[PDB]
């Protein structure tokens, strides 16, 4: 088991989270100066090159050593909990690996990382060509995407459809486990994260050629399978009947930028109150969310700084 040491290490690491006043000074900066600014902080100890892809890799190396070792440093109930947050990034990693296997293109041009599923596991999966070999490799850690996969892949081996159904079964299983750890901050975070996911998923995956009801998930509020199909066709009249959410004020808006800003800023504030339950997974949950949103923000600023895009194109996003 055991979160005591883990929680203690994670608090010390908070001492080096990038502050809001960073991103104020940063907006006034071009790319060369942002890099000089960036190298002072802890991402800076992994910063390399003057190219943009070399920065992207430098973010990945920071994330590896400060977030991706975290399931490994603890066991039992603690490992399952840290795992559940990391699983969602593993789900991006599996989908990309699986696609490289199915479409016959290199291992390369995927985003991997270590956590529950290590760098070599993904390498082993790629190297097990047969779907059955593939299925057993993934069963080795025993992790919830395996158990979702075993059920899913029996029905159908159509790639885009495997992904979709892998997501729904994976989320039905997750929703229960995360509600079930009985931490009130995580449960409140979970209901909004789910409501938010159903909305967001419909925007991204419209025009895929798949079912609407293969993108629904357990934790959902006023939303139902019928409404998800309504949205996937492109109707925002679902939102004027959606209420009780704190997202209720993003209703009536068609502008993509303004909607996504509002969902994201709420979830940020929600997770930050996770320190009112630092016990358990609270403190690491808060940590993962703040460090992800800083990396996104590092990337938005860099691009804005290099290419001469407006100050306001990112200044609005960085202050919630």
């Amino acid at each position: 088991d055991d979160f005591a040491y883990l929680n203690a290490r994670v608090r010390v690491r908070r001492g080096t989270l990038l502050k809001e006043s960073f991103f104020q000074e940063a907006l006034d900066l071009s790319f060369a100066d942002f890099l000089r600014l960036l190298s002072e902080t802890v991402y800076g100890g992994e910063l390399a090159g003057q190219g943009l892809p070399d920065v992207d890799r430098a973010v990945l190396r920071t994330q590896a050593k400060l977030v991706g070792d975290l399931p490994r440093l603890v066991t039992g109930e603690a490992r399952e909990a840290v795992r559940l947050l990391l699983l969602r990034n593993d789900l991006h990693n599996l989908q990309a690996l699986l696609r490289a296997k199915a479409t016959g293109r290199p291992f390369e041009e995927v985003l991997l990382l270590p956590g529950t599923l290590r760098e070599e596991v993904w390498r082993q999966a790629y190297e097990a060509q047969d779907p059955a070999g593939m299925a057993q490799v993934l069963a080795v850690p025993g992790h919830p995407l395996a158990r979702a996969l075993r059920a899913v892949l029996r029905e159908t081996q159509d790639l885009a459809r495997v992904e979709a159904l892998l997501a729904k079964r994976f989320f039905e299983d997750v929703a229960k486990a995360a509600k079930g750890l009985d931490q009130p901050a995580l449960r409140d975070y979970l209901a909004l994260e789910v409501d938010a996911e159903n909305l967001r998923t419909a925007f991204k995956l419209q025009g895929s050629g798949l079912a609407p009801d293969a993108f629904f998930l357990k934790g959902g509020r006023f939303v139902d399978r019928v409404r998800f199909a309504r949205l996937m066709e492109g109707d925002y009249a679902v939102l004027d009947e959606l209420s009780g959410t704190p997202f209720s004020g993003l209703s009536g808006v068609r502008d993509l930028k303004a909607l996504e800003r509002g969902l994201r800023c709420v979830l940020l504030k929600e997770a930050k109150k996770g320190v009112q339950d630092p016990l358990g997974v609270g403190l690491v949950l808060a940590y993962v969310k703040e460090r992800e949103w800083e990396a996104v923000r590092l990337r938005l600023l860099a691009r804005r700084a290099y290419f001469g895009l407006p100050r306001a194109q990112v200044e609005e996003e960085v202050v919630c």
Binding site: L52, R303, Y306, F307, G308, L309
Partner: protein, 100 residues
């Protein structure tokens, strides 16, 4: 397709709408441009003004006729780029018909 420009703008040809994996490699991206169009089997060949082909004549002199998949100047970089008005007007009148 085969459309290429700067890196950031090259990303989205990697997705759908357009096909592409390149970016710059030369002055007009000759390394890719010539070699590629030799086959010409691509759905579209568009070379943006992010590379800038000053000798659009190199491709025409070598192809010796083909309007099927051959560069179309657009822009490929943002600086509130909508300057292909004042540029195209002068690019047409000067060499074809009477000057401005």
């Amino acid at each position: 397709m085969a459309v290429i420009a700067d890196p950031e703008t090259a990303q989205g040809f990697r997705l759908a709408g357009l096909e592409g994996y390149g970016a710059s490699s030369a002055e007009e991206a000759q390394s890719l441009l010539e070699t590629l169009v030799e086959r010409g089997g691509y759905a579209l060949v568009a070379v943006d003004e992010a590379l800038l082909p000053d000798p659009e004549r190199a491709v025409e002199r070598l192809m010796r006729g083909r309007d099927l998949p051959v560069l179309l100047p657009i822009a490929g970089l943002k600086e509130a780029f909508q300057g292909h008005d004042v540029e195209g007007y002068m690019r047409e009148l000067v060499r074809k018909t009477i000057g401005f």
